[PDB]
Design a binder for this molecule. Structure first.
Ligand SMILES: *C(=O)c1ncc(Br)cc1OCc1ccc(Cl)c(Br)c1
Ligand SMILES: *C(=O)c1ncc(Br)cc1OCc1ccc(Cl)c(Br)c1
Lengths: 296, 299
């Protein structure tokens, strides 16, 4: 029993972290087969408005110092795919897990292995609707990755920057930014964020599953009118079918839970799962995984 | 920037996790060198088990130890306090540098939750003052361990049981934390808040820009402690004050000043405001935890 914010076991990703060095700038990289992936701004020196194509031309393999623990690795080719730099090394990573690269959707969750100088510092478990993440990232963490595990690791996130507002932005493993952000040190606006409605519902189920039922007691269209006032993501029929298994195990219909949430937004000093705010960083899949103890 | 509850990277502990089966019972074990450690109730068919006389009826080959796909051969078995020790014929090639430590109430650690010898997830926990842990443990999780990392892994906790709904267990020598025993029958203490941790978390908040709670008062260790008692908070000691030094100097706020701010939050409540994204006072970060995260300690 009990319910915690749970990250995936991180060992399979630890053996993929490397230190990437270019000039003074060093950051974290991801060594998979014979390729090291890292943020392209590792080639940035005073360069606010980097012309990355121009900058990468001034650069040669020799200027790329990749360190895998102690041992250095030889760079034998380099390229830019959108905002990631791909450094072809001559040794395939022997600790390479089965993996895929994936682009997740707003509201889905993943584990971040926060890393500095190619070495793991900690791991924690959402992509916000506005495509930021509320993480814990210090200067030097660039290149840390987010991932889910299915024995196969789905890499979904590579950390690129700390925004002035204290939230963080990055790319999938093909270098496409999540959200409107660019890899320039300029002021950049994130959207209005919203609360992830189907995740809050999922967490209300985890609450019932763990014995916290006091919030129990509407219709889809009635609900979206109240949720829009409180800055909640609209709830779609897809979201309702996603919550189906939790409804089945609890015996509480999806639109009943939505009625419970309506009253919760209108009225508010009690706790739910020992929190005094509504949590939206648990997906329905997260709730099922933890409450039925999926292993890897 | 930002501040999360952060667990240690779990890979070194992942390579030590095994499955241990005895009759109808399967749980997790910790395999370091040529020894596997697991809860002794692995041999229980409970309510009031006579553990010595249940161990009598057991031989080495009654213990199935599985490491991934490999079967290990059990050449010895003994019981130390509430853990069972199983000698196997093959040292664990992946044994990290490790120590066994008994931690103190209010210290934190990472739990690698496990089923059938396989990991499910990792989360950061604190030993409550009543020596329970508010974990996430389903049936089968017994044997999962809690740890801190220094490249050395110090194991502090092994999961044993769910009380009627928090969690109880032992250090790696099999001594329970708290007054608990391994029978299905038990009242935990009164759970106080861990004051030095709440203080450190207020320091973390200040470091991250949340300063609205900073007040115009000071107080005294004794004046503060009187209020701590009233609100079921742990007494604050000079040792706690000295542990807060680095955070006091980094932020330039006297510990006793932070204490006065906390006194105002305890007496006036929070008024629907939040601190570091939480609308409660958090006490599962140690001063060390705050420092490691804010400075980026690696392993
Ligand atoms: C990012 O975390 C990072 N990591 C290592 C080093 Br050395 C420097 C870093 O920040 C540089 C940086 C460049 C461009 C942007 Cl947009 C940001 Br935000 C940070
Ligand atoms: C506990 O995690 C566990 N795991 C697998 C199996 Br099979 C049985 C388990 O516990 C049963 C049990 C024995 C003794 C106590 Cl004191 C408790 Br709670 C549970």
């Amino acid at each position: 029993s009990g319910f915690r914010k749970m990250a995936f076991p991180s060992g399979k990703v630890e053996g993929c972290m490397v230190q990437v060095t270019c000039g003074t700038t060093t950051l974290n990289g991801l060594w998979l087969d014979d390729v090291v992936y890292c943020p392209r701004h590792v080639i940035c020196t005073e360069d606010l408005n980097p012309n990355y194509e121009d900058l990468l031309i001034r650069k040669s393999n020799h200027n790329f110092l990749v360190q895998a623990g102690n041992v250095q690795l030889r760079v034998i080719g380099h390229s830019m795919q959108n905002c990631v730099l791909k450094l072809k090394v001559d040794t395939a990573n022997p600790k390479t897990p089965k993996y895929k690269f994936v682009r997740i959707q707003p509201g889905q969750t993943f584990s971040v292995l926060a890393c500095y100088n190619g070495s793991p510092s900690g791991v924690y478990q959402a992509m916000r609707p506005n495509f930021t993440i509320k993480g814990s990232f210090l200067n030097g963490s660039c290149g840390s990755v987010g991932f889910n595990i299915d024995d196969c690791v789905s890499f979904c996130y590579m950390h690129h920057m700390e925004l002035p507002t204290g939230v963080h932005a990055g790319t999938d493993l093909e270098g496409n930014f999540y959200g409107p952000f660019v890899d320039r040190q300029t002021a950049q606006a994130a959207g209005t964020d919203t609360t992830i409605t189907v995740n809050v519902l999922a967490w209300l189920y985890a609450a019932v599953i763990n014995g916290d039922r006091w919030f129990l007691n509407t219709t889809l269209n009635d609900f979206n009118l109240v949720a829009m006032k409180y800055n909640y993501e609209p709830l779609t029929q897809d979201h309702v079918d996603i919550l189906g298994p939790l409804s089945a195990q609890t015996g509480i219909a999806v639109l009943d839970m939505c009625a419970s949430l309506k009253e919760l937004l209108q009225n508010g000093g009690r706790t739910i799962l020992g929190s005094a705010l509504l949590e939206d960083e648990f997906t329905p899949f997260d709730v099922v995984r933890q409450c039925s103890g999926v292993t890897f």
